[PDB]
Amino acid sequence: SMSVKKPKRDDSKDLALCSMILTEMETHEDAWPFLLPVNLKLVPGYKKVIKKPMDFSTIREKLSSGQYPNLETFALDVRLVFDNCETFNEDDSDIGRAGHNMRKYFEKKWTDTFK
Numbered sequence: 001s002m003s004v005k006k007p008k009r010d011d012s013k014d015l016a017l018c019s020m021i022l023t024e025m026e027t028h029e030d031a032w033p034f035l036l037p038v039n040l041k042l043v044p045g046y047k048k049v050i051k052k053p054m055d056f057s058t059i060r061e062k063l064s065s066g067q068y069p070n071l072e073t074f075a076l077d078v079r080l081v082f083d084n085c086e087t088f089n090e091d092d093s094d095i096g097r098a099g100h101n102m103r104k105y106f107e108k109k110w111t112d113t114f115k
Contacts, residue, residue, distance in 0.1 A: 014071045018063060021109050025078070026056055028105060030098040034081050050087060054080040071114065078106055 025031060037055045040047040059077050068074045085099030 017113055018071060018074045021113060022060060022063060024109060025102065025106060028102060030101045031056065033095045033098050034102065050084050052080060054084060075110060
């Protein structure tokens with residue numbers, strides 16, 4: 001509350017460390033469904049159904065231009081990528097399996113880097 005604060009967690013490396021995680025996600029062999037925004041002209045249903053599209057390139061641009069206020073808003077966009085994927089793709093599909101694999105990969109890196 002006013003003039004009453006928990007001890008200050010060092011957040012000075014968060015930007016660098018989120019960049020490194022995002023690099024690792026970009027270079028994973030199962031990243032291909034997530035590298036670029038879904039083409040809303042060419043994929044019937046996507047625009048109406050997926051209210052907030054998100055992809056790795058869009059996260060990279062937001063990250064590089066100071067549009068994440070803190071490491072939690074960064075995790076929220078990464079998870080959005082996988083939540084969108086599950087919304088639109090059957091679990092038993094190459095892209096559906098890709099999304100599960102990447103979400104796992106991300107959540108481990110996230111825990112090991114920050115928890």
